Amino acid sequence: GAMGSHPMCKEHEDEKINIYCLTCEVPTCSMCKVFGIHKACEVAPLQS
Amino acid sequence: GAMGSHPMCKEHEDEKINIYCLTCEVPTCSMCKVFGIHKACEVAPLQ
Ligand SMILES: [Zn+2]
Ligand SMILES: [Zn+2]
Ligand SMILES: [Zn+2]
Ligand SMILES: [Zn+2]
């Protein structure tokens, strides 16, 4: 969604929260999955 | 012409081009690595 409405990652300030970590049960960002703390996790797109 | 903006992924329109596929040697987006055609590749942040 639009900037100003879409929550941004605390770790990656320029990345929208755009995925869901199924392993951790938290929404998070794709950079956290590629390079960060959710690298080992099962994740899914939030969508849209 | 306009001032700068951040290039966005063709496949993932809401995603910034924010990584570099070291394998394919091309800039791409993190969603292409997570779920897309670069899932198999080694990548790094443009940062
Ligand atoms: Zn993140
Ligand atoms: Zn996780
Ligand atoms: Zn992409
Ligand atoms: Zn690649």
UniProtKB/Swiss-Prot annotation, chain A:
Zinc finger (B box-type): 4-46
Location of this chain's protein in the cell: Cytoplasm; Nucleus; Cytoplasm, Myofibril, Sarcomere, M line; Cytoplasm, Myofibril, Sarcomere, Z line
Binding site for Zn(2+): 9, 12, 32, 38
UniProt tissue specificity: Muscle specific. Selectively expressed in heart and skeletal muscle. Also expressed in the iris.
Cleavable signal peptide: none
Superkingdom field: Eukaryota
Comment block on domains: The RING-type zinc finger mediates interaction with SUMO2 and localization to the nucleus. Also required for the E3 ubiquitin ligase activity.
Known role: E3 ubiquitin ligase. Mediates the ubiquitination and subsequent proteasomal degradation of CKM, GMEB1 and HIBADH. Regulates the proteasomal degradation of muscle proteins under amino acid starvation, where muscle protein is catabolized to provide other organs with amino acids. Inhibits de novo skeletal muscle protein synthesis under amino acid starvation. Regulates proteasomal degradation of cardiac troponin I/TNNI3 and probably of other sarcomeric-associated proteins. May play a role in striated muscle atrophy and hypertrophy by regulating an anti-hypertrophic PKC-mediated signaling pathway.
Subunit structure: Homodimer. Homooligomer and heterooligomer. Interacts with SUMO2, titin/TTN and GMEB1. Interacts with TRIM54 and probably with TRIM55 and TNNI3. Forms a ternary complex with RACK1 and PRKCE. Interacts with CKM.
Identification of the protein by name: E3 ubiquitin-protein ligase TRIM63
Native organism: Homo sapiens
Gene (name only): TRIM63
Interval of the full protein contained in this chain: 117 to 161 of 353
